[PDB]
Design an enzyme around this catalytic site. Sequence first.
Site, PDB file in Angstrom:
ATOM      1  CG  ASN A 124       2.533  26.722  13.301  1.00 53.73           C
ATOM      2  OD1 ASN A 124       2.429  27.115  12.146  1.00 53.73           O
ATOM      3  ND2 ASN A 124       3.586  27.002  14.058  1.00 53.73           N
TER       4      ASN A 124
ATOM      5  CD  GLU B 139     -10.851  15.811   9.976  1.00 52.44           C
ATOM      6  OE1 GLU B 139     -11.808  16.590   9.770  1.00 52.44           O
ATOM      7  OE2 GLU B 139      -9.747  15.926   9.407  1.00 52.44           O
TER       8      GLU B 139
ATOM      9  CG  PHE C  33      -2.249  24.987   4.790  1.00 53.11           C
ATOM     10  CD1 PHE C  33      -0.862  25.034   4.648  1.00 53.11           C
ATOM     11  CD2 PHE C  33      -3.024  24.580   3.710  1.00 53.11           C
ATOM     12  CE1 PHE C  33      -0.253  24.666   3.450  1.00 53.11           C
ATOM     13  CE2 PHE C  33      -2.428  24.208   2.508  1.00 53.11           C
ATOM     14  CZ  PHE C  33      -1.039  24.250   2.376  1.00 53.11           C
TER      15      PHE C  33
ATOM     16  CG  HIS D 103      -6.901  14.247   8.247  1.00 55.96           C
ATOM     17  ND1 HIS D 103      -7.282  15.399   7.589  1.00 55.96           N
ATOM     18  CD2 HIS D 103      -6.179  13.522   7.354  1.00 55.96           C
ATOM     19  CE1 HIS D 103      -6.787  15.384   6.362  1.00 55.96           C
ATOM     20  NE2 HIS D 103      -6.120  14.256   6.192  1.00 55.96           N
TER      21      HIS D 103
ATOM     22  CD  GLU E 275     -13.251  19.072   2.522  1.00 56.99           C
ATOM     23  OE1 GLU E 275     -12.073  19.404   2.284  1.00 56.99           O
ATOM     24  OE2 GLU E 275     -13.580  18.483   3.570  1.00 56.99           O
ATOM     25  CE1 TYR E 276     -16.370  23.598  -7.366  1.00 57.42           C
ATOM     26  CE2 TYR E 276     -17.577  23.050  -5.348  1.00 57.42           C
ATOM     27  CZ  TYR E 276     -17.475  23.763  -6.533  1.00 57.42           C
ATOM     28  OH  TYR E 276     -18.487  24.628  -6.876  1.00 57.42           O
ATOM     29  CB  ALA E 277     -13.180  25.528  -5.859  1.00 54.34           C
ATOM     30  CG  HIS E 278      -7.943  24.467  -0.683  1.00 57.46           C
ATOM     31  ND1 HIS E 278      -6.837  25.197  -0.311  1.00 57.46           N
ATOM     32  CD2 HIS E 278      -8.390  23.864   0.443  1.00 57.46           C
ATOM     33  CE1 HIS E 278      -6.627  25.045   0.986  1.00 57.46           C
ATOM     34  NE2 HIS E 278      -7.552  24.238   1.465  1.00 57.46           N
TER      35      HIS E 278
ATOM     36  CD  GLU F 189      -9.653  15.429   5.426  1.00 57.39           C
ATOM     37  OE1 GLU F 189      -9.589  16.253   6.359  1.00 57.39           O
ATOM     38  OE2 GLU F 189      -9.037  15.584   4.351  1.00 57.39           O
TER      39      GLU F 189
END
EC number: 3.2.1.23
Lengths: 1015, 211, 174
Positions: B205, B24, B209, B26, B145-148, B69
Amino acid sequence: VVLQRRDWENPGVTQLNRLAAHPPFASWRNSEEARTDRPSQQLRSLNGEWRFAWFPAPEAVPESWLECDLPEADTVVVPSNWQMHGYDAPIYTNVTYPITVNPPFVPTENPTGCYSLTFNVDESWLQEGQTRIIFDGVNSAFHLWCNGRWVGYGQDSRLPSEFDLSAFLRAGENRLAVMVLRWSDGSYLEDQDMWRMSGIFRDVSLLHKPTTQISDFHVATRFNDDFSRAVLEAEVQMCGELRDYLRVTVSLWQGETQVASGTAPFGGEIIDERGGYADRVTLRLNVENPKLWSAEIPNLYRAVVELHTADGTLIEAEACDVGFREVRIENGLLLLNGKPLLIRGVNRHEHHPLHGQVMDEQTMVQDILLMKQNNFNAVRCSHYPNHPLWYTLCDRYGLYVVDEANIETHGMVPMNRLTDDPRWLPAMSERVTRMVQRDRNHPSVIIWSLGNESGHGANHDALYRWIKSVDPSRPVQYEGGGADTTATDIICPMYARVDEDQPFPAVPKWSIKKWLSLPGETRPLILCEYAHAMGNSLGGFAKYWQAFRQYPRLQGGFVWDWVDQSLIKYDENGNPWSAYGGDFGDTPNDRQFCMNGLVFADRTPHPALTEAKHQQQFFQFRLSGQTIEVTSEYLFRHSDNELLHWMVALDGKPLASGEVPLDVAPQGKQLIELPELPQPESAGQLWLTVRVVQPNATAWSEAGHISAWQQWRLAENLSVTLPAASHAIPHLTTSEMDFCIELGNKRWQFNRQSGFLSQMWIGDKKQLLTPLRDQFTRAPLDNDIGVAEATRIDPNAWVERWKAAGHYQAEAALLQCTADTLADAVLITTAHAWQHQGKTLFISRKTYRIDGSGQMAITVDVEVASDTPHPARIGLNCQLAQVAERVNWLGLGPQENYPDRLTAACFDRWDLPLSDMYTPYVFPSENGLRCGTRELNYGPHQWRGDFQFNISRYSQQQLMETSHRHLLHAEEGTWLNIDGFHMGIGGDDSWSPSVSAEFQLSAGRYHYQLVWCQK
Amino acid sequence: PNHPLWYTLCDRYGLYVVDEANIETHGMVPMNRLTDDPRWLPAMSERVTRMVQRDRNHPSVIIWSLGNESGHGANHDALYRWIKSVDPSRPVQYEGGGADTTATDIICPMYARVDEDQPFPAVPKWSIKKWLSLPGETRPLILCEYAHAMGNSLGGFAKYWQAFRQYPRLQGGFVWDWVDQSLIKYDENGNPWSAYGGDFGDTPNDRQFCM
Amino acid sequence: VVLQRRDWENPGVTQLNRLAAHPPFASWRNSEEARTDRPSQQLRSLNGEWRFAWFPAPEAVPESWLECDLPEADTVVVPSNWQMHGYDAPIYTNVTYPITVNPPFVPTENPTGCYSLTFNVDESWLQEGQTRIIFDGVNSAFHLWCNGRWVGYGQDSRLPSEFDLSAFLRAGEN
Ligand SMILES: CC(C)S[C@@H]1O[C@H](CO)[C@H](O)[C@H](O)[C@H]1O
Ligand SMILES: CC(C)S[C@@H]1O[C@H](CO)[C@H](O)[C@H](O)[C@H]1O
Ligand SMILES: [Mg+2]
Ligand SMILES: [Mg+2]
Ligand SMILES: [Mg+2]
Ligand SMILES: [Mg+2]
Ligand code: NA
Ligand code: NA
Ligand code: NA
Ligand code: NA
Ligand code: NA
């Protein structure tokens, strides 16, 4: 640390501190120099005299050498291969690795070349910007020190290695130290069939770039459907500090005319969620009615990339030649600019008989000129990226190029052992990716190759997709693993035959006609290698071209190969001779297998080259009554430098000639009606010959260049008139041992013990040195010999079958020898059996008829046992006493031609010196045959009939027994071979029987007739 | 790739696993800066090849992922093809560079909505119902990925499942995510509390999250 | 060599002397044990109490540490993250890298965990066959020594790194 890490035994380390690969840079600081491709002061050559010392291993190199010159060192020219200076032996091996197969390890005895250069750098180069050294080619791996400090390390013998020297250089005197290793983990990927040499064999240069620099640029050209509009897209990358005032201008030039221009600040489009490349820009330039690039018309533009400030101050400029062309595969066909290509290709190694693998511009231009002059339009970089100038030359002269990654692991068991191994993916990826990054802007490069003879591994599939993803503008091909794997856009077999299947397990070589239509198969087929031109070869070459023309998806191939890899050695008197595998004490070796060229190492043509030229002709001819139809196989050009010369000759005597201008559109036809020809009075065959002549000189040819030719038989008038009978009558004199025929002062002697014409006399001068005997054997060609099958020699090879059947040892047994007197002639009748240890191989039945006119008519009828291997020839031979200067014949010529390689030869009256009737093949064999001969003249002798012949000062026996041409000695008198029948020479490959059935002497019964007389 | 016991447990208890290479990038600008660079291909290849060599025998592993990502680069295309070549038994997916690139057998977006398009430049997140029927598109769609599920969340979760059942080619997705990444800290009283980003003096930071 | 080569700042060096990757092995010498997935005598765990010392950079690590235990080291449980033992701070960042983006370089102040284990090896393991060590996960890069001698190097935090120790080990304490 350097000796501790052993980076040359680690496929995970292919470099240390090496700069990114990129297209050719010169860092011009003047835009007009960039445009006109003038020299750049920022690009210096370090070629010339260097210091060199040889060591047996890297552990033997003294540390003091990093600091100062070794007194023991010599002064040598660079670039060079150190074998060429005699520091150690070059090795010729084909498949078997020159080192024990134990990856990633190499022998502890690892020949080490210690190069050094003391040179000046001006302070201006160090005060600002970046100074890099470029090693265009170092074989096989090397460490670099500058002023005693270690800089970096490099692998891959065939692509440039670059290092930033900015922090290492001082103003004034500097010293480079380069330790070149002969063997490395890289050698496992460099098992090409060629001399194994080493050293700094390509250019060394210094390049100064500004700190803010063009670090890369890519040029693409996309087109509309009819190619009347193009977009030129240029992606430009920079390094150094980004500033708002920076700008990139890309301008496109046709000659001295600027055709298009675009300027932009840096900042690419949004790529993803994180934004775009702030350090890149893409310029798009519109071009209306671009002049298109092809091998036919190599139209080139010049693109200039300028890095500059908004107010117009130039920082630096780079540039390249741009060829507007589209390469694509559609509906199973490889198209260039919308049109299906026909690849008239050759494989070309980088080889010089004196300089080894060091390439020079003169040799390169010579090869290209000869290629184009012989109707080649394409070259394969077998099997590595070439010297960078090669591509520039192909761009300008017009040749299609297959650029090939430096990856060959032929000697592995199985062949894909490394290339299926993910551990070797990094090392393989660099060989592919760095080639693409270097060469992607050359228009001559139309196809990428993943390497050669390395099986098919998952590593190939990954790198295939990498290329397809970064460069969609060029198909990718790869032959390994059966030539039609998922790693190739083109079915690209090597030595697949036209009609004959070779169904090897796992990797079959289908006949090329069959291959195209296998269930589910849609791709174009282009042979990456075919027609192995080893020695007396290229038999059946016309069969390939007939199929290429008939089948749309057969789009040609690349002959193996261009140039004999012979090396020069010197005898005691300083006379140079051509050497091959084993001649340097190199062992194990593959002897003469390094010599497979259409030309000798000094670029003198082999006879096979003319067959190539004829078959690869760009105009096709048909004859119907009075009308000649000329078809153009050009795709893009009109025939605007072409005229047709025609000539009608009766048995070599010109009767009528003429010329018509050719005006043929690409793929078009022109009809040319000949005038009604006058009737010739005398008997014989009329022959029509047409030549296509180029009146005007070109970049690649002289005025008067012949590009194409064809012949037809016209009317024939058979000889019906009785030869006005001579009054003279020959006399038969019989003894127990001899039949002697006498006419005036002419005498024919027939030995009654042997049954052969043992001697002939004109007055007191003898005519023969050996008796006229049947011959069924030839000195074996390379194609007859093949290869050794490990524990023994391949029993399937023609030579091995001939030897085993006792063909070379066969002794004649006389069955019958009789003499008869006729009304106006003497008749001698003989019969011989050739036997090996009780088995009858051949029976020869002859009649000799000597009449009043002095003519001896020989009739030969031969039976060949059906269970003996088909014989190399059915003919007669003798050693003539006379050595004459000229050979004159009515037949196929002027060059050497064989039954399966005679399409290029023309029927006419030819006159050559005796020495030209011998072909100086480095490995001696049967040679110099001319076929379809009706009359032969040599000194006092004339032979008439319908035969093939060769004539030289070397017996078949000597040719058979001598390994090198320089070891041949002219024999007393002249050896004549006259064949009623001669077997094909083959050549589809040179390691298995390759003579097609219709060219083997399999009929069982043969007849030929000959007339011997004085002229 | 997970602790090796994870795959044994998924084999035996029965869970379908997407095995994902440890790649990754990102924070690169742009996101594909390293993954498009051939100098980083060797390091990238090892993270993919060595995952496949380790895990290829687990039945629970049904899909290979090229990472997360990291934009879309030419190195993804190479490594995608490498996997298809060595293991034809499992589809390969990858979300980077727009969720429907040449490096994925599965349209696998993150946080694409049910009915609402989010037409970002270069990398749009189309409505999942719409994505399926885009001109020329044939692949299955499964949200990587969905519905965080950050704090008081999963609003509109029913809306995804209604669509999943209605549309055959909407074959579900992977919720983000299973477990709050809070860490335990201790105060003066020695009592444990749940800590997030910044609570260790870590800076910069991204605070809560991680949960 | 180790401090000189800086293999942790070179994306072309992802390992040194690491063995090929493969499916899970246990090397059972009994077929029934293999069939039932019971423990293998040939697969030992080295988890448990190790010795650990934290340093701010690899340059700060004493050469003596290769040869013998550092008195200032603590005895810690392995497997572990050293942030969870309080030696430095764990960092929560989402997108932005926790280090300056300057590939392939990392900060010169680069927290360095010095782990060590004194452990025993049966003489039978050394008289025959091959003894390898398997590190299932080390974050983010590491050099390995055995009995003072350098063995190799590994990258990728999430896959096992394996090294052949046959030539490095002695019967008894290592
Ligand atoms: C002899 C064959 C088994 S290999 C054969 O050798 C040739 C010799 O010129 C060429 O190198 C060919 O590329 C190769 O296929
Ligand atoms: C905040 C977005 C711009 S990036 C977003 O952050 C999330 C926070 O949990 C997850 O890590 C997602 O995978 C990521 O796409
Ligand atoms: Mg190496
Ligand atoms: Mg080979
Ligand atoms: Mg010049
Ligand atoms: Mg590293
Ligand atoms: Na064709
Ligand atoms: Na050869
Ligand atoms: Na010979
Ligand atoms: Na569904
Ligand atoms: Na998160």
